[PDB]
C-alpha cells in the first residue's frame, strides 16, 4: 500500500541513494544479502513500501540506479547491500554525460531515457497502490539534470495521477565544480518548476558546514554529507512504515505544505544533532529538540531563515513524546518567533507523531520549512547564470548539440520569475 | 430492548472509539475474546454461547488506522467485517474524502451498516464519531451523514467531534475542511456534541494533575461523557432520562443543536483521598468555566437550557437542594426564554475507571450537557482563521483539483454566518 | 482602451425544457446595474445583490449587446488598442453558438470590424490593414491550435507559440468558412450534460495591423489585438459523472481558479506574479492591466431549476468586481 518507486541519478544521485537504501534496510530489519531477520512484525507490516517481497524472505529495493559511466554501477555493487538492489535494475550507458546538460537531454540522455523508463514502467505495473516516485539527483552536472528532467518529465506525463517527489542537490554560491555549473543549473530548474510536485533543495555548502560546525567532524567526506541527507529522506517517509499517534503520509504532507501550487521548494532539516563529545550535555526531551530544529544554524540550506519569514513549516515527530508536549512547543515557537512567519496562515505548523524513534534515539524530529529565504538559493544561481549567459560563455558547448538560444531566455525567465514570487511573500 | 450502532470515522475516529469500547467492556465485564466468565445487548450482540461482540464499523481511507485496530488486543472481540478502509488517505483533503475517495468506501460501510440494523430491533440511533479539522472526519463523514439520513432518517443521529481549538491546531487547511463541514453537519445531524482539545489537554494538567497528556488521556475523558449519555440506555435509575427525551429537552428552536459538555468530579488519585465530595459539591464544579471540555465562558453569556445527570450514590432529595442551590447563584443565567430550563436525571450505576487512568474512582458523579449561547465564541474563531486562508485562495487549489467548486467555500461561509446568527437571536 | 474591467451578465429566456420543468419558476430580477437573486433557499428570502455594469435581463438580444459594449470595444481595438474579452456561462447557454453564431459575438464582430475597415480604406484612399487570426485552444493542458489541420511549445522572446498558425485576413468570409472547418475540430468530453461537449479554453485571436496612411502617420503602426476567449466553464463533477472528467476539472476548474486569482491579484494591485501561474495566464497576459480594453461577459438562465450552478455562475463572475 502506496508504494514508492526509487530512481537514483547520476553518481551524487547513486550515492546518496546507496547511503539511503543502508539506512532504510536497517530500518526494516534486512541484512546486507536482502534477508530479513529483524525485531518486530511492523517491520514486515509495511515493508512493501520500499520493497519487492521474494521468495527466500528477500526483499529488493524498489529502485532503479541510472548514469552513462558504467563504473557507477560496479561501484554501487562493490558496496553492503549492493546484493539486495535488482540485478536487472542497472540501467546505465557508455559515455558520461561531459558535464552537459543538452548531452544529456536532447543526446546521449535520450537514448538511457527511453531504456529507463521501461524499467520504471515494469517496476511501476508491479505495483498494487502506488504513492509516488521518489527522485534523487543534483542539478549540477548532465545526468541528474538532463537525465533527470527528461525521465522525470516522460514519468509525471505516464504517471500523472502519483507523486513525483524530488530530492536533488542544489549547487553551491561558492564551492563550484564545473565552469557551466550555471547553465546546468539553470536550464533543469526551467523544467524542475513544471515536473516535479515536491522539491527538496539539498544544499551541498550548508550540508558541508553543518558536519564540520555541529556534528564538530574533523575531516568529513562524502559519506558524511549522505548521512545527514538520508537522515532527511528516511525522515520523510516515516508514518508511511512506521505508525504513530498522529499518522500522516506524503499527499498530507504535500496538501498542508504547499499554498500556491509554484511553492514546492523546500529546506530539509533533522534533529537532534550532536558531536560525539556533545552528547554528555544532552537534554533528551520535546524542547530539545525543538530549540534545535528551528535553529537556523541547522538548516540544509545556504539561506538563512533568519533573514525572511516562513509560509509554511512541518515537523514530524517520531518516538517517547506526549502530544501534549508537542503541541506546545509549537505553540511556543510560534509566539516567540512570531516576527518570523508569514501572518496569512492561522497557525504556521503542521505536525505529525510517529511512535517509533530512528534507531539509537530516544525520539527525533524530521524539519521541513517552506521558507521565504529560499529565493536566495534561486536568486544567486540566477546572477551567476546571467553572468555566463550574457558573454555567451561556454554556448558553443550546449548550441554545439542543437539547443536554440530561446531556450537559455526562458530557463533564465522561469527562475527570475521564481525568485520575484517567493520574495512576494516577505 | 433499546440500542446504538456505533460509527467511526478518521484516526481520531477510530481511537476514540477504541478507547470507548475499551470502557464499554470494563463496565460490563467482557472479556477481549468476547466472553463473559442483560442491558449488554444495548451494544454488545449475543452472538452465540460464549460469544458477544459490539456493534460498530470502522472506517479510515488509509489502511493503518483500522490495522492498529485489526491488530490489538480487541482483535478478538471484533468481527472483522466490521474493519473497513481505503488504500490511500484524504490527505486533509474534504474534497478528497467527499467526491474522490470516500466515492467508493462509502457502499462498502453502507452495506456494513445496513447488516447491522437488519440484526436487530431496538435500533433507537446511531453514534458517530469524527474531527471537523480532518477529511475522513469531514469529507467521507459528511458524505456518509447524508446517506445514512435517507437510509434510515427517523433514527437518532447523534455525534461527538473535535472542533479546532483556539491555538492548537494539526494542520493548516484545517480552516477549511471545519467550515465545510459544518455546512453539512447543519442539515444532517440531530444532535452535536461538541469537543475541544486544547480546552481538555488543560483539564488533564489541572484537574487530573497530569503534566504531559497523550491522546489516552484525551480519551479517557472523551469516553466518560460518552459512558454517561448512554447510562440511562444500559441501566437502571432512580429518573429514567431516555435519549431521545434528551434530545426532547434539549432544543428549543429547530435550528439550535450544538450542546456543550462537562463532567465532574476529575480530580486525580491521589487528590481523591482528601476531596469532599458531596452532591452539591460536585453539582457545584460543573458550572465552573474552567471545568468545560470545550472553549467558551458561560460567564459572558446565557444558558438556553441545562441537564444534569447524576451517577452513583445520590439521593434525589439532595439532587433536587443542589439545583435549587443552583438557581440562586445569580452568576448563571438563563434564557428569558426558559424559566423552567432545568432538567435532571439519576442513574443508579456510578462511572467506572479505565486501568491506568489518572481519573479516580468516586461514588458520585455528574455528566452535563448544556446548551448556550456562550457557544459563538467557537465559531467566531473558525470565521477569521478560515477568511484569511479564504481571501488568497490559499491551498484551494487542493480541494479544486477533487472536483470541489469554488462556491461551495462561499455558501459553507454563509452558512456558517448563519449559524453563529440564530444563536445569537435565540440568546433572549 | 486599456484595462478597465467592464462587467456584463446575460439573462436568457428559458429554454424548453426549462420551462416544461416545474422549476421554471424565475427567481432572477435585473436592475440596469445590480441582480437581485431572490433567495428562497430554506424559505429564508433575501434580496441577494450582485453588481455589474451590464445587468442585462432575458430580454436583451445580440445586436443589443453588441451596442451596449461590444459595439464600443471594437471600435476602441480598431484605433490601435488590444483587446481581450472572455466569455463564462452556463451549460444548456448554447454559448458554444453564441459565440460566433451567423449573429454571435465573433460574427457581429466580424462584420463590423470589415464593414469599418472598408470605410476607412475608402477615407484613406488601403490602410494596409491586415489580420491575423488563431483559435488556441487548451485541451488537458495541452495547446490546440484549431486554425491549423503538435509541438506547440509557448516561448516568449514576443509572446508566441511555436508552429502557431497565422491566417492573414482580407475578408468576412474568409473568417466564416475558416471558423466553419475550425469548429469541425473542436475535440470534446463524454458529459452527462452533453456527450459532445467542448472540453476546452479557446482564445481566438483576431490581431489587426493597422497603419495610419494620412498624409501624416503614414510611419505607425498599431495593432487591433482582439482576444475573443471561450473559458469552458466550471464542470460540476455530477455532469460528467471520468478519467477526461478529472483531466478537465483541472484543466478548467484550476485553471479558471487560476484566473480568478489573476484577476483579483489585477484588480488588487498585486499583479504580475499570477502571469505565470497557467498557460492561459501567460497567453492572455497582455490583458493584464496594459494597453488592452477588457471585457467579461457571462451567461445564465433565470429558472429555479438552475439556480445553484447559477449561484456558482454568479459567484465567479461577481468577483470580478468583489473579489
Ligand atoms: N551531497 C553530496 N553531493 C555530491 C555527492 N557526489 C557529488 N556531489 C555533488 O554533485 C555535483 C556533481 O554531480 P554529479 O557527479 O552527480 C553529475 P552526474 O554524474 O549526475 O552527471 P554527469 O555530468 O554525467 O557526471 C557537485 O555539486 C558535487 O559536489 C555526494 O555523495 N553527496
Ligand atoms: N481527543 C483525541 N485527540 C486526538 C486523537 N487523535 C488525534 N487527535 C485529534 O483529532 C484530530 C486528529 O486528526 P486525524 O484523525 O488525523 O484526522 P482525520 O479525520 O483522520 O483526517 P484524515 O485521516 O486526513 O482523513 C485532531 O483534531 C487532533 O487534535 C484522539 O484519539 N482523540
Ligand atoms: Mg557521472
Ligand atoms: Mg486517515
Known amino acids: 500500500m502506496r508504494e514508492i518507486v526509487h530512481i537514483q541519478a547520476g553518481q551524487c544521485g547513486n550515492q546518496i541513494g546507496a547511503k539511503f537504501w543502508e539506512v532504510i534496510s536497517d530500518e526494516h530489519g534486512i541484512d546486507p544479502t536482502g534477508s530479513y531477520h529483524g525485531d518486530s512484525d511492523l517491520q514486515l507490516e509495511r515493508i512493501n513500501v520500499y520493497y519487492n517481497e521474494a521468495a527466500g524472505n528477500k526483499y529488493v529495493p524498489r529502485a532503479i540506479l541510472v548514469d552513462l559511466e558504467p563504473g557507477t554501477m560496479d561501484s554501487v555493487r562493490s558496496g553492503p547491500f549492493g546484493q539486495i538492489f535488482r540485478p536487472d535494475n542497472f540501467v546505465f550507458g557508455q559515455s558520461g554525460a561531459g558535464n552537459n546538460w543538452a548531452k544529456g537531454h536532447y543526446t546521449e540522455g535520450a537514448e538511457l531515457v527511453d531504456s529507463v523508463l521501461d524499467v520504471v514502467r515494469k517496476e511501476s505495473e508491479s505495483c498494487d497502490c502506488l504513492q509516488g516516485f521518489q527522485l534523487t539527483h543534483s542539478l549540477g552536472g548532465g545526468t541528474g539534470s538532463g537525465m533527470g528532467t527528461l525521465l522525470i518529465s516522460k514519468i509525471r506525463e505516464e504517471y500523472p495521477d502519483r507523486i513525483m517527489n524530488t530530492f536533488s542537490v542544489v549547487p553551491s554560491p561558492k564551492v563550484s565544480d564545473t565552469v557551466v555549473e550555471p547553465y546546468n543549473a539553470t536550464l533543469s530548474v526551467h523544467q524542475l518548476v513544471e515536473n516535479t510536485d515536491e522539491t527538496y533543495c539539498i544544499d551541498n555548502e550548508a550540508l558541508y558546514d553543518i558536519c564540520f560546525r555541529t556534528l564538530k567532524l574533523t575531516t568529513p567526506t562524502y559519506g558524511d554529507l549522505n548521512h545527514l541527507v538520508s537522515a532527511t529522506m528516511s525522515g520523510v517517509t516515516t508514518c508511511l512504515r512506521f505508525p504513530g499517534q498522529l499518522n500522516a503520509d506524503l499527499r498530507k504532507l504535500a496538501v498542508n505544505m504547499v499554498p500556491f501550487p509554484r511553492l514546492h521548494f523546500f529546506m530539509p532539516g533533522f534533529a537532534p544533532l550532536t558531536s560525539r563529545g556533545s552528547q554528555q550535555y544532552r537534554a533528551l526531551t520535546v524542547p530539545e529538540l525543538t530549540q534545535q530544529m528551528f535553529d537556523a544554524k541547522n538548516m540544509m540550506a545556504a539561506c538563512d531563515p533568519r533573514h525572511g519569514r516562513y509560509l509554511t513549516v512541518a515537523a514530524v515527530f517520531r518516538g517517547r513524546m506526549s502530544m501534549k508536549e508537542v503541541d506546545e512547543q509549537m505553540l511556543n515557537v510560534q509566539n516567540k518567533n512570531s516576527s518570523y512567519f508569514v501572518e496569512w496562515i492561522p497557525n504556521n505548523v503542521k505536525t505529525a507523531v510517529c511512535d517509533i524513534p530512528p534507531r539509537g534515539l530516544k525520539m527525533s524530529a524530521t524539519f521541513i520549512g517552506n521558507s521565504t529565504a529560499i529565493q536566495e538559493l534561486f536568486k544567486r544561481i540566477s546572477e551567476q547564470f546571467t553572468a555566463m549567459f550574457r558573454r555567451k560563455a561556454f554556448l558553443h558547448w550546449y548550441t554545439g548539440e542543437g539547443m536554440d538560444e530561446m531556450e537559455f531566455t526562458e530557463a533564465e525567465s522561469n527562475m527570475n520569475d521564481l525568485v520575484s514570487e517567493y520574495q512576494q511573500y516577505q | 430492548m433499546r440500542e446504538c450502532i456505533s460509527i467511526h470515522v478518521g484516526q481520531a475516529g477510530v481511537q476514540i472509539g477504541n478507547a470507548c469500547w475499551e470502557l464499554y467492556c470494563l463496565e460490563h465485564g467482557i472479556q477481549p475474546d468476547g466472553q463473559m466468565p442483560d442491558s449488554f445487548n444495548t451494544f454488545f450482540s449475543e452472538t452465540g454461547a460464549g460469544k458477544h461482540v459490539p456493534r460498530a464499523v470502522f472506517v479510515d481511507l488509509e489502511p493503518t488506522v483500522i490495522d492498529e485496530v485489526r491488530t490489538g488486543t480487541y482483535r478478538q472481540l471484533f468481527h472483522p467485517e466490521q474493519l473497513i478502509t481505503g488504500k490511500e488517505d484524504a490527505a486533509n483533503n474534504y474534497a478528497r474524502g467527499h467526491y474522490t475517495i470516500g466515492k467508493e468506501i462509502i457502499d462498502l460501510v453502507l452495506d456494513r451498516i445496513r447488516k447491522l440494523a437488519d440484526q436487530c430491533t431496538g435500533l433507537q440511533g446511531f453514534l458517530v464519531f469524527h474531527s471537523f479539522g480532518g477529511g475522513t472526519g469531514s469529507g467521507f463523514t459528511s458524505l456518509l451523514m447524508e446517506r445514512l439520513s435517507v437510509d434510515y432518517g427517523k433514527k437518532s443521529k447523534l455525534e461527538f467531534s473535535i472542533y479546532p481549538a483556539p491555538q492548537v491546531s494539526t494542520a493548516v487547511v484545517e480552516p477549511y475542511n471545519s467550515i465545510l463541514t459544518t455546512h453539512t453537519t447543519l442539515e444532517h445531524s440531530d444532535c452535536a456534541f461538541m469537543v475541544d482539545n486544547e480546552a481538555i489537554y488543560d483539564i488533564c494538567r489541572r484537574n487530573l494533575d497530569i503534566e504531559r497528556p497523550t491522546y489516552t488521556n484525551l480519551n479517557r475523558l472523551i469516553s466518560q461523557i460518552v459512558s454517561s449519555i448512554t447510562a440511562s440506555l444500559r441501566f437502571d435509575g432512580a429518573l429514567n432520562v431516555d435519549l431521545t427525551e434528551f434530545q426532547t429537552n434539549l432544543v428549543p428552536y429547530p435550528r439550535i443543536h450544538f450542546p456543550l459538555a462537562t463532567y465532574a468530579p476529575v480530580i486525580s488519585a491521589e487528590k481523591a483521598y482528601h476531596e469532599q465530595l458531596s452532591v452539591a459539591e460536585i453539582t457545584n464544579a460543573c458550572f465552573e468555566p474552567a471545568n468545560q471540555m470545550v472553549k467558551c465562558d458561560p460567564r459572558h453569556g446565557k444558558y438556553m437550557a441545562c441537564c444534569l445527570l447524576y451517577r452513583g450514590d445520590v439521593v434525589p432529595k439532595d439532587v433536587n437542594a443542589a439545583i435549587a442551590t443552583i438557581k440562586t447563584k445569580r452568576s448563571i443565567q438563563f434564557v428569558d426564554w426558559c424559566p423552567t430550563g432545568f432538567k435532571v436525571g439519576i442513574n443508579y450505576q456510578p462511572p467506572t475507571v479505565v486501568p491506568g487512568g489518572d481519573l479516580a474512582k468516586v461514588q458520585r458523579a455528574v455528566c452535563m450537557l448544556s446548551n448556550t449561547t456562550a457557544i459563538a465564541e467557537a465559531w467566531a474563531r473558525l470565521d477569521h482563521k478560515f477568511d484569511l486562508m479564504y481571501a488568497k485562495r490559499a491551498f484551494v487549489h487542493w480541494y479544486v483539483g477533487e472536483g470541489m467548486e469554488e462556491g461551495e467555500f462561499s455558501e459553507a461561509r454563509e452558512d456558517m454566518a448563519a449559524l453563529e446568527k440564530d444563536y445569537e437571536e435565540v440568546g433572549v | ?323
Not at chain 3, 459595439?71 to 456561462?89: A, K, P, R, S
Not at chain 3, 490546440?144 to 509557448?154: E, F, G, N, P, V
Not at chain 3, 468530453?189 to 461537449?197: D, L, M, R, V, W
Not at chain 3, 484588480?267 to 492561459?280: G, H, V
Request: hydrophobic share 35%; net charge positive.
Open chain 3, 1 to 323: 482602451s486599456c484595462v478597465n474591467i467592464k462587467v456584463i451578465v446575460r439573462c436568457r429566456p428559458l429554454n424548453e425544457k426549462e420551462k416544461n420543468d416545474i422549476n421554471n419558476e424565475e427567481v432572477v430580477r435585473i436592475n440596469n446595474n445590480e441582480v437581485i437573486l431572490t433567495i428562497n433557499r430554506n424559505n429564508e428570502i433575501y434580496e441577494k445583490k450582485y453588481s455589474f455594469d451590464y445587468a442585462c435581463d432575458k430580454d436583451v438580444d445580440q445586436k443589443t449587446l453588441f451596442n451596449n459594449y461590444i459595439y464600443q470595444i471594437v471600435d476602441e481595438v480598431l484605433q490601435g488598442f488590444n483587446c481581450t474579452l472572455f466569455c463564462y456561462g452556463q451549460t444548456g447557454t448554447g454559448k458554444t453558438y453564441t459565440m460566433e453564431g451567423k449573429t454571435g459575438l465573433i460574427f457581429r464582430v466580424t462584420k463590423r470590424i470589415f464593414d469599418i475597415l472598408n470605410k476607412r480604406k475608402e477615407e484613406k484612399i488601403m490602410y494596409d490593414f491586415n489580420i491575423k487570426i488563431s483559435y488556441l485552444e487548451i485541451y488537458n493542458e495541452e495547446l490546440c491550435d484549431l486554425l491549423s489541420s503538435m509541438k506547440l511549445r509557448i516561448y516568449e522572446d514576443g509572446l508566441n507559440v511555436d508552429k502557431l498558425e497565422e491566417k492573414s485576413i482580407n475578408s468576412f468570409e474568409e473568417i466564416y468558412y475558416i471558423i466553419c472547418s475550425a469548429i469541425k475540430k473542436r475535440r470534446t468530453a463524454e458529459t452527462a450534460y452533453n456527450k459532445k461537449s467542448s472540453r476546452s479554453h479557446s482564445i481566438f485571436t483576431i490581431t489587426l495591423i493597422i497603419k495610419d496612411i494620412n498624409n501624416v502617420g503614414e510611419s505607425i503602426t498599431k495593432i487591433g489585438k482582439l482576444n475573443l476567449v471561450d473559458l469552458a466553464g466550471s464542470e460540476n463533477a455530477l455532469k460528467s459523472s471520468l478519467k477526461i472528467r478529472q483531466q478537465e476539472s483541472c484543466n478548467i476548474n484550476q485553471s479558471l481558479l487560476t484566473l480568478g486569482r489573476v484577476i483579483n491579484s489585477l484588480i488588487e494591485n498585486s499583479s504580475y506574479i499570477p502571469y505565470r501561474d497557467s498557460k492561459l495566464t501567460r497567453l492572455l497576459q497582455d490583458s493584464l492591466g496594459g494597453k488592452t480594453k477588457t471585457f467579461i461577459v457571462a451567461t445564465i438562465s433565470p429558472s429555479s431549476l438552475c439556480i445553484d450552478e447559477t449561484l456558482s455562475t454568479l459567484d465567479y463572475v461577481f468577483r470580478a468586481k468583489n473579489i
